[PDB]
Amino acid sequence: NREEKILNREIGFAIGMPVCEFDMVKDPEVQDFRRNILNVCKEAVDLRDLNSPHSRAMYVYPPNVESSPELPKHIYNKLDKGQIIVVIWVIVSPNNDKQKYTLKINHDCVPEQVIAEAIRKKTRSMLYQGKYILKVCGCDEYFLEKYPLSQYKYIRSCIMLGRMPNLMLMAKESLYSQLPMDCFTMPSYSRKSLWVINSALRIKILCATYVNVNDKIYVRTGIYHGGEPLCDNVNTQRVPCSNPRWNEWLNYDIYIPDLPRAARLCLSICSVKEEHCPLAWGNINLFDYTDTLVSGKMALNLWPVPHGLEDLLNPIGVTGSNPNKETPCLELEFDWFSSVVKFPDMSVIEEHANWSVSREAGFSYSHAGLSNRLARDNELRENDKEQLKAISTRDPLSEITEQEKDFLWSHRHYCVTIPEILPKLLLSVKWNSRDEVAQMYCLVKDWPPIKPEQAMELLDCNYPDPMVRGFAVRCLEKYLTDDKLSQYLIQLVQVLKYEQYLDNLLVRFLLKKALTNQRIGHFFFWHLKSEMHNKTVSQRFGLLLESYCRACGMYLKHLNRQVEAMEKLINLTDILKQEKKDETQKVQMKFLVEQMRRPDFMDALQGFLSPLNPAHQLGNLRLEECRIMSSAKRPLWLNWENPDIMSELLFQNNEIIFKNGDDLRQDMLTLQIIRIMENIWQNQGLDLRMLPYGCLSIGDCVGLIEVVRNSHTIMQIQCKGGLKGALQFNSHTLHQWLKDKNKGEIYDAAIDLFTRSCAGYCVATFILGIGDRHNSNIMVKDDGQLFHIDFGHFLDRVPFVLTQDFLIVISKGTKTREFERFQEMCYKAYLAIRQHANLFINLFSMMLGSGMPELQSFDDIAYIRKTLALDKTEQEALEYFMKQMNDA
Ligand SMILES: COc1cc(Nc2cncc(-c3ccc(C(N)=O)cc3)n2)cc(OC)c1OC
């Protein structure tokens, strides 16, 4: 149709590639995914239309709320007898005169209560009900739901910073008119044996093409469950890369029924010189998406070897044939049987598991042979029931011995009472045994649901099993809030890559949520779009962005404006850091102004939503304020007028830093972790103010960074311009600048705010291992709030040692009441993150599959164990932190 034609040009624009490339793809799974995922789209659209227009308004403008209405004592204590002074604005008559009405209301007041109060006071000045809604003055944020006013992030932030909440009273039909009508049109494209086999595992290696220049090459193979081998690495006989035709049948020490559903064939082509090196690699799922075992011949286009490849095989790598068909291919032949070998149904598995129970009690009572894995009845002592608890407490990176692993499996039936031990129990299973596995599948079909956070440990590279993964999705479906979903969106988008198939529960959960919450959808899109260049994931994400773009609605137009501006900034910075790179800053600027003033560049970058917070409108550009920065890689400091009619109550101007050349994934994770550390601290009752400024990677080493208003680097303060020098840098200079900025009842707050942000960042940088910190890495705001920029490296010793310049601001002139109070905060902060060690390990663990340099192995994540002192007791760790900290 005409509608469809127009749409695929639009989807194609936002996705980076045209829709018709997906049309021409002939792979059962791809066209099956393309079609099958449309019900999620329908489900999501129908949830939007289910309570039209309110539920549609909620989709586009979801309430931005904290996860709980409970205010920690220090947040509550800020309120005037548990009450908040709030200001309601009303735009009246033709001249759009802004009338304000200040109210003192309960912090837990519903928005509708607050509106009624504003109307009460509106009439009581001169001396309706559900016809109005509340909007945040200066940004596209609405308070459309019955949550208490304080539960909203804008209101809780206002309380904490001691800022006056300015809100605007808006007509419901004024917002409802601004809303478009959904039109999810269904696309054009939408219109045997089993476990019997008594054979061993054998696969033939025919030949390899596209291989040449420089001694002898062999094919190395392996059978894996995630990254754990289910047998021995079987290899082909060495051949020089002139005629690589082995045509030999490789035999493995696994029997066809003992193969788990998540079993993979991990192969590679290696070279020999005492010196072995991998050349090209490739992984295959031993079962397809319909659950059929691989039958016949196959041509696997292999992948280049990523630098720093520890082994000869890459089992953690992406499963499937490289899309670049002009790369080293490797033909294989697989054993044929009666017809088609499909994986047994859960019923067949249940009958075999109930047998692996009735005839296992017929193998312990009616066989003789011992296995320290046989579950014994009435032989579950309280002496070892506390031992299971002792194992369940341990961190995800804590090595579990063979003695402990055997003990756990034997007590599998008890472990249901302690559901948090599931990750330790699953790793205790012999996945190379169909008897143990069948018993486990059944325990998981009935396993009690665990917290979303614990269920995430099960969604990493260590747990490939579909039913283990399915349980984990069900836990996030039932217990994960939309707020916590926004927090872990980075790791959740990442774990998609580990999934064996295009169509899974994780993707359906994530897409549904993305298509039911435009805020979740926004970052979901950008997180996927930022990885389209990566040809390892480009397909999966390309299909996902298609299904998203079809059912996202009129927001696709808003995404296209963002994509167009982002490309013009890339193209501009491309020409600049190529044609004018070694030239002077005055020349680069001369060129920048000349180029930005072009008609096509002007309108692509004016009047669009900011990708950093889509609720922020970016109007006209303040070119007089747009400059190339003095900082490294030459970032582009951009300024935009805020077109909001009440911009003067939030920020008249919006400033974004456009970086082209540096990887921002590391800075993104650090700031996600910082934000999580801050929440842990705030809930726990410690007010360590952190500044997790917005950072978003938008492509291959391109990205955006939120400009922190009224802030300067440590160097900028220490100089006062350049009237001092690196030697002449007097230690008291920092405190003096702060003193001149804040005087009177203002000064005491400033020092407090400094010491607090100081204590938080000391603890944060130490745990995380954020090293190479200096005067151009640390920053301070006008109000004394400290923060850190450019997270160069992490995990690779005191990562941030206390400089005199800071301790002096902490007091005035090492042995002060302020330093004693300070030291305490750091000890208190350290102990709080230690109580959450299991979360941070998992969050980091889910990132190994992301192509990050300083997060490749479980040897990088182990650093968190050393800085948090997990092995030691809580009081023992304090002695460790005390020792590392007591060093000046
Ligand atoms: C770093 O130097 C400067 C910074 C800023 N301002 C701001 C405000 N909020 C944030 C940042 C920031 C954050 C992260 C990263 C990163 N990830 O690289 C880089 C910069 N920068 C202003 C400067 O001169 C006026 C300046 O040059 C001396």
Swiss-Prot record:
Annotated effect of mutating Y863H: Found in an endometrial carcinoma sample; uncertain significance
Stated consequence of mutating I6N: In MCAP; increased phosphatidylinositol 3-kinase signaling; decreased interaction with p85 regulatory subunit; no effect on protein abundance
Q: Which residue stretches belong to region G-loop? A: 628-634
Known consequence of changing E399Q?
Answer: Found in an endometrial carcinoma sample; uncertain significance
Name the Enzyme Commission number(s) assigned to this protein.
2.7.1.137, 2.7.1.153, 2.7.11.1
Q: Which GO terms describe its cellular component?
A: cytoplasm; cytosol; intercalated disc; lamellipodium; perinuclear region of cytoplasm; phosphatidylinositol 3-kinase complex; phosphatidylinositol 3-kinase complex, class IA; phosphatidylinositol 3-kinase complex, class IB
Consequence the record notes for mutating Q403P? Found in an anaplastic astrocytoma sample; uncertain significance
Which Pfam families does the UniProt entry name for this protein? Answer: PI3_PI4_kinase (PF00454), PI3K_C2 (PF00792), PI3K_p85B (PF02192), PI3K_rbd (PF00794), PI3Ka (PF00613)
Site Implicated in the recognition of ATP as well as PIP2. Also crucial for autophosphorylation of the p85alpha subunit: which residues? K633
Tell me a Gene Ontology molecular-function term this record carries. Answer: 1-phosphatidylinositol-4-phosphate 3-kinase activity
Q: Which PANTHER family match?
A: PHOSPHATIDYLINOSITOL 4,5-BISPHOSPHATE 3-KINASE CATALYTIC SUBUNIT ALPHA ISOFORM, PHOSPHATIDYLINOSITOL KINASE
The UniProt subunit note reads as follows: Heterodimer of a catalytic subunit PIK3CA and a p85 regulatory subunit (PIK3R1, PIK3R2 or PIK3R3). Interacts with IRS1 in nuclear extracts. Interacts with RUFY3. Interacts with RASD2. Interacts with APPL1. Interacts with HRAS and KRAS. Interaction with HRAS/KRAS is required for PI3K pathway signaling and cell proliferation stimulated by EGF and FGF2. Interacts with FAM83B; activates the PI3K/AKT signaling cascade.
**Associated pathology:** PIK3CA mutations are involved in various type of cancer. Mutated isoforms participate in cellular transformation and tumorigenesis induced by oncogenic receptor tyrosine kinases (RTKs) and HRAS/KRAS. Interaction with HRAS/KRAS is required for Ras-driven tumor formation. Mutations increasing the lipid kinase activity are required for oncogenic signaling. The protein kinase activity may not be required for tumorigenesis. Colorectal cancer: A complex disease characterized by malignant lesions arising from the inner wall of the large intestine (the colon) and the rectum. Genetic alterations are often associated with progression from premalignant lesion (adenoma) to invasive adenocarcinoma. Risk factors for cancer of the colon and rectum include colon polyps, long-standing ulcerative colitis, and genetic family history.
Protein name, entry field: Phosphatidylinositol 4,5-bisphosphate 3-kinase catalytic subunit alpha isoform
Q: Which organism is it from?
A: Homo sapiens
Give the taxonomic lineage as stored in the record: Eukaryota, Metazoa, Chordata, Craniata, Vertebrata
Q: Which gene encodes it?
A: PIK3CA
